[PDB]
Amino acid sequence: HMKSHNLLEAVRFDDQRFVMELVHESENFKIVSFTFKAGQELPVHSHNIEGELNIVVLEGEGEFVGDGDAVIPAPRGAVLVAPISTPHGVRAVTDMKVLVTIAPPI
């Protein structure tokens, strides 16, 4: 076991690209955060396997990106749920942090 992470207590930016940080990994799920400066992006991708992910916008605003660069607005508190095999990406409009939970883990 049991533990907490204050994910907005101190965020880490990188001006050249997004920052990826492992929050948790077990047999049950993998939890990772992505911290973006405004305009940065986690490019659209997928892993050709079973399971789903959810992407929760913790801070800032952005877009959930998919197949053909199609976008869903991702305001703070928005959650995207998708199969891991479905192309997904994230684009930050403002400085932004998201949490990704993947189950089962890749």
Add this chain to the structure above:
Amino acid sequence: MKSHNLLEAVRFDDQRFVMELVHESENFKIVSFTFKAGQELPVHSHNIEGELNIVVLEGEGEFVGDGDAVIPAPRGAVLVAPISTPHGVRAVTDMKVLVTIAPPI
């Protein structure tokens, strides 16, 4: 596939916390809980393997465990715990959390 703006049209109930199913599949169950300040998701556990995570989307609270032990849960805090470890949530301010359970019970 599908997105939910969980801080849009937030629903509170004066008498009890509001639980809303976000997503359910074989992989995980995703549920939101919306609390007025002072409301609580009572400490609970199920004797089965798996874990849950609780993400604070808005407001501030406390993650609650065995013996009423607390861990501050500011906005953006994430609790990860076994499903079998006693876990609850207490809202200090009006609060909304997202809970992901894997595998779902």
